[PDB]
Design a protein around this nucleic acid. Structure first.
Lengths: 60, 84, 215, 128, 101, 118, 154
RNA sequence: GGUACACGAAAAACCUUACCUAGACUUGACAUCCUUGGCAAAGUUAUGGAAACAUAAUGCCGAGUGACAGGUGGUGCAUGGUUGUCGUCAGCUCGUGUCGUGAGAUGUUGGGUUAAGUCCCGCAACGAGCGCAACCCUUAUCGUUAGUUACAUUGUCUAGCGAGACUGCUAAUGCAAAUUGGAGGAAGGAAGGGAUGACGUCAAAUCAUCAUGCCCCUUAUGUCUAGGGCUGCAAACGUGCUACAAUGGCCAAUACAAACAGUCGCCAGCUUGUAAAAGUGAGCAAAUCUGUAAAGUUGGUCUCAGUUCGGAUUGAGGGCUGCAAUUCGUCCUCAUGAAGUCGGAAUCACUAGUAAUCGCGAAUCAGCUAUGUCGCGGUGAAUACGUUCUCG
């Protein structure tokens, strides 16, 4: 029932009592940013692809 | 009603309480939402509150008025004092 | 071990293709999503002509796209039959009102990328021909028409239930240590009746003169 | 006259103007008294140990401007500026100050705490 | 006057693009505009985002991505009609972001 | 008040161990009596002691506060309530896990046999 | 297989010019900071001062020097047991353990202020009464059954 | 068991939810074969109702229907992708070649000699590839860039960059690697930190991130809303943490920041205020303006104990937003003053800004008892006897 999760993600609850966000591709809404709406796995995978301009590896 | 505000109710679980109030109250109403604080009218009232499958009746009275319908209903289950 | 060298060498070795700069972080994800869809339309359209890169250069309502086509006849043909369709279809995803600007740019050594090489390796693996000769020809072609060292691998299964004759092909300058290797790396999740098969390619795009800058 | 020293230590930066004069030495930081600006420690006596390691404090009115850090990082930065101003004046004394790494920047700052790690290298206990 | 005070901030993650844009501003205004402040690298607002690596559980090697935000502050107090006539040849790079201030 | 009055020790803070009289109410009693925090003295004022049983005795008896809190707890626990249930189980009420915590109600964490995965 | 390596020791304090009290500051600091230990230690030199009229330098040296060992019972095991062979203990470790023992004993006999107890322990180690001298005593007296271990190498 | 456990989870008032059900959904919310066009399903006002789902209209665009859409539905020895362990281990392979009929050695081996297979000396090897090292980035000097919203003790603040140290030099000098001598110096000898951990290993973890093969389900494995668990408790283990106090507790003044966040937000200021908060109100689209720097310092205090430690849980009242605060958030005040007066097997991080302190802003966050994380800064340890025992 992952499509239930996704179509509830695309829809917005009628109150601010009920609220969450999740990736367009990933399930497991835990650990998701509000700057891109992308889950940790999808974000890390697209960042290893250089999707966001400037995602680098820290060397101090 | 909270510790931050006066007696305020969402007025959708009290809605049916009152709707039956103008008609010689009988208490049990199918309400397991947790959005109504209590009032001097909720004395004697019971509501079938959902725990995870069934809707347990919870007695309400005029003892204290500093809680909601969710606080006046056991929302969880305990160990049943089991050693397993 | 061997943390994935995909993100490990963007910015220091690999280049960034799609640049986008919006305002406060509300529709930045929208810009990212629109850019990736528009740029991946080309990538999912052609797999025989093998279009490689389309840089959508966006900054505050200044969008510039640039297609790098390997075969102009496959991307244009007679009476520009292909491009107008793109000029139609992207017009539905990029917006009717906004302008659609792009041109076919020339480039040397068009196989210094990894995605198309991986696609060709998969085609050779499942091309209904003696497979070993097919991959010998494909590697000879990628090494011949202009390129640096290659690193091609296939993992998964042999069209059975086990990959026993996997071949790890390394040629020329493949230093994972060197921070100037100019190595582009891609992975392909091929779909078949034996589960997803991973075809991964590292490719050196030319020894730049000791540069740590995104050239 | 115009002797111009610069110093950095523990995220503290500082310049100092030093000029030959016969005053107490204008002991001050940002032109104000170090009563409660700094803790009253040995560090307040070490405040003029560059002057103790060199010509006495009765010279070189300290006109020190500072930015950032704390007090010991601040003190190290301003004393590095003091020794560099002394270099600008008489660099034979630069030798002994550099011998304890005063003229040269000491480049000792808190090691950056890392990902997952509690601090620079602190890690939790875990056997099995 | 076009701007009583032109507090234009130009910033991006690429310093070379920022350098290029700020120089182009410099010599294109150099001779047709005065009271300018040339290339001023301001302290960076760089930060790092830390995420897990394994699909499922792992907290032993927390992967990290760095976003560095430079800042160049151009302060052109006066903008003139001749200034714009000579300055109509400046454009906004794909990385560099200019402020209308 | 008169409870937890130390001898040759500051009267100001020793009241905090009383049930019903903490630091703020202790200080209220002290400054209402103007006891002027002392140098390890049992009590600075000797006459004001009678003023104590003139005004400080007028303070609410904490023994009654104990039974008021007890009856309020009785009402809260007897009616249907999640916090009432937590009262009934003699555990943290406002909501805390007892997987490892609750080292004030279940004793000093009496270690028993582990009934866990096999 | 760590070999001979140097140590970083803060140089002697300008007000007393002793490196030993500086290693004491190195090893006593609460919460790992000298921003607060040095005040009370200078207080303690003062407390030594008006108590028994002991100048800090000589009393501190006569206290630290009398707790210092000379024998290294180098470990040698059998994988089921262990024994000690007496060699000469290193001088750097000599002074290190001396100062560590002095500092760690210095802070006991929990009472009204730590100034009185630290001056008391400094005085006790000064007068050679048993509070830290026992370390030097044992480091040689328990090396008597281990003195038999000096007859052979294993 | 470690290569499972302050996890996946950078925040759960119901959704997140993968679990359960109640109201409800029947090719389904979506998705479309097909079929046609003409203009709209929105959202609202009542309502059974906990809201759906049943209510009616209101406001280029719809609108129905099979296969399917879709499946956190399962199948990590069926898998990819991704990720950790040995391992940032000093070593690992191959082309050509010799020989042992050969498994293969081999080059790699080895002496000194290195961070490295680092050099040479010799080696049935000559070479190359992998790794590492090195290249590269960062802290570190002088000059150069522009000067404000830095400053204004004005180039203090900055990174854009250049000169720039590398046994460079000299001698102790080893056939070679390569140490140190003293000075110039920012670096002086892997300058310090980060950095790709080779084949492999765990028939590694990952079907539940994602893509998933086979099969399945489909008028259900489809969807809306309501509630609960993700903080239960016989409970244990783990994990930091909390102190076990007089450098400490309390009171008062208390400096020095970095840092990021912020446009119906930071929210100054201002007042009521112990305080949350209540009202009030600019500048700041952030070098403007806002969100204290604290510990430390300066004096008093407590003068040894379950204590002026520690504040545990707890009750009452105010408080934030959230439509309404209770769980499935929290803040403050008042009141509670337990255990622990340094704790065994076990022990983890450590060669300096190290172990420890102190606070700050934020990521997710309208909420966060995440005592947790990203960080950031201030203060600031000895030690290394040798690997004895073990690991690798």
């Amino acid at each position: 029932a992952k499509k239930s999760l996704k179509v509830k993600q695309t829809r917005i609850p009628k109150f601010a009592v009920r609220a969450y966000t999740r990736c367009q591709r990933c399930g497991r809404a835990r650990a998701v940013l509000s700057h891109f709406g992308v889950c940790r796995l999808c974000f890390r995978e697209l960042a290893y692809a250089g999707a966001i301009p400037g995602v680098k590896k820290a060397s101090w | 009603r909270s510790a931050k505000k006066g007696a305020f109710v969402d007025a959708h679980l009290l809605k049916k309480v009152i709707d039956m109030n103008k008609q010689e109250k009988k208490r049990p109403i199918k309400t397991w939402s947790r959005r109504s604080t209590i009032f001097p009218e909720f004395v004697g009232n019971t509501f079938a509150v959902h725990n995870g499958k069934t809707f347990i009746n919870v007695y309400v009275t005029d003892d204290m008025v500093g809680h909601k319908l969710g606080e006046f209903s056991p929302t969880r289950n305990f160990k049943q004092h089991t050693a397993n | 071990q061997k943390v994935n060298s995909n993100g490990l060498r963007f910015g220091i070795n690999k280049n960034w293709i799609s640049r986008w700069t919006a305002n406060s972080h509300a529709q930045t994800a929208k810009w990212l999503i629109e850019d990736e869809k528009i740029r991946n339309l080309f990538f999912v359209n052609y797999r025989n002509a093998q279009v490689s890169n389309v840089e959508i250069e966006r900054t505050q309502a200044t969008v510039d796209v640039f297609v790098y086509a390997a075969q102009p006849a496959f991307l244009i043909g007679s009476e520009n039959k292909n491009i107008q369709k793109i000029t139609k279809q992207i017009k539905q995803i990029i917006g009717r009102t906004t302008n659609l600007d792009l041109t076919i740019n020339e480039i040397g050594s068009p196989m210094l990328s990894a995605r198309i090489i991986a696609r060709d390796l998969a085609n050779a693996i499942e091309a209904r021909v003696p497979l070993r000769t097919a991959m010998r020809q494909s590697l000879i072609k990628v090494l011949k028409a202009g390129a640096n060292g290659i690193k091609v691998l296939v993992s998964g299964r042999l069209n059975g239930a086990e990959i026993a004759r996997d071949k790890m092909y390394i040629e020329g300058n493949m230093p994972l240590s060197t921070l100037r290797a100019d190595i582009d790396y891609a992975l392909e999740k091929a779909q078949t009746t034996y589960g997803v098969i991973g075809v991964k390619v590292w490719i050196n795009r030319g020894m730049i003169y000791t540069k740590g800058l995104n050239r | 006259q115009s002797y111009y020293g610069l110093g950095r230590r523990k995220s503290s930066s500082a310049k100092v103007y030093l000029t030959p004069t016969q005053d107490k030495g204008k002991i001050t930081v940002n032109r104000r008294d170090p009563s409660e600006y700094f803790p009253n420690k040995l560090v307040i006596q070490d405040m003029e140990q560059p002057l103790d390691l060199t010509d006495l404090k009765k010279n070189f009115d300290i006109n020190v401007v500072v930015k950032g850090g704390g007090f010991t990082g601040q003190a190290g930065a301003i004393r590095l500026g003091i020794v560099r101003a002394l270099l600008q004046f008489n660099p034979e004394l630069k030798k002994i100050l550099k011998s304890k790494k005063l003229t040269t920047r000491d480049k000792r700052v808190k090691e950056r705490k890392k990902f997952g790690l509690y601090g620079a290298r602190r890690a939790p206990q875990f056997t099995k | 006057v076009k701007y009583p005070e032109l507090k234009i901030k130009l910033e991006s993650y690429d310093s070379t693009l920022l350098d290029l844009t700020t120089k182009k501003i410099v010599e294109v205004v150099k001779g047709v505009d005065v009271k300018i402040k040339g290339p001023l690298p301001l302290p960076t607002k760089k930060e790092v985002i830390t995420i897990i690596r394994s699909p499922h559980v792992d907290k032993a090697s927390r992967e990290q991505f760095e976003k560095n935000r430079h800042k160049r502050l151009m302060i052109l107090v006066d903008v003139n009609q001749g200034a714009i006539d000579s300055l109509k040849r400046i454009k906004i790079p794909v990385g560099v972001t200019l402020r209308f201030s | 008040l008169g409870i937890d009055i130390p001898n040759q020790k500051r009267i100001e803070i020793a009241l905090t161990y009383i049930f019903g009289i903490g630091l703020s109410r202790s200080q209220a009693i002290l400054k209402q009596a103007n006891i002027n925090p002392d140098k390890r003295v049992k009590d600075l004022t000797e006459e004001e002691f009678v003023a104590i049983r003139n005004v400080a005795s007028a303070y609410k008896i904490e023994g009654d506060l104990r039974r008021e809190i007890a009856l309020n707890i009785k009402h809260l626990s007897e009616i249907g309530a999640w916090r009432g249930l937590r009262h009934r189980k003699n555990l943290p009420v406002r909501g805390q896990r007892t997987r490892t915590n609750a080292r004030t109600r279940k004793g000093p964490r009496k270690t028993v046999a582990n009934k866990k995965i096999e | 297989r760590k070999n001979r390596a140097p140590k970083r020791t803060v140089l002697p304090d300008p007000v007393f010019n002793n490196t030993l009290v500086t290693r004491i500051i190195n090893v006593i600091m609460e919460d790992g900071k000298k921003g607060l230990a040095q005040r009370i230690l200078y207080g303690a030199f003062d407390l030594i001062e008006q108590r028994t009229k002991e100048k800090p330098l000589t009393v501190f040296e006569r206290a630290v020097g009398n707790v210092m060992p000379r024998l290294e019972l180098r470990v040698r095991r059998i994988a089921g047991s262990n024994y000690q062979v007496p060699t000469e203990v290193p001088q750097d470790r000599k002074i290190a353990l001396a100062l560590r023992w002095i500092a760690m004993f210095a802070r006991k006999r929990h009472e009204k202020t730590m100034l009185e107890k630290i001056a008391n322990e400094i005085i006790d180690a000064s007068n050679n009464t048993g509070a830290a001298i026992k370390k030097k005593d044992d480091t040689h007296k328990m090396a008597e059954a281990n003195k038999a271990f000096a007859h052979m190498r294993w």
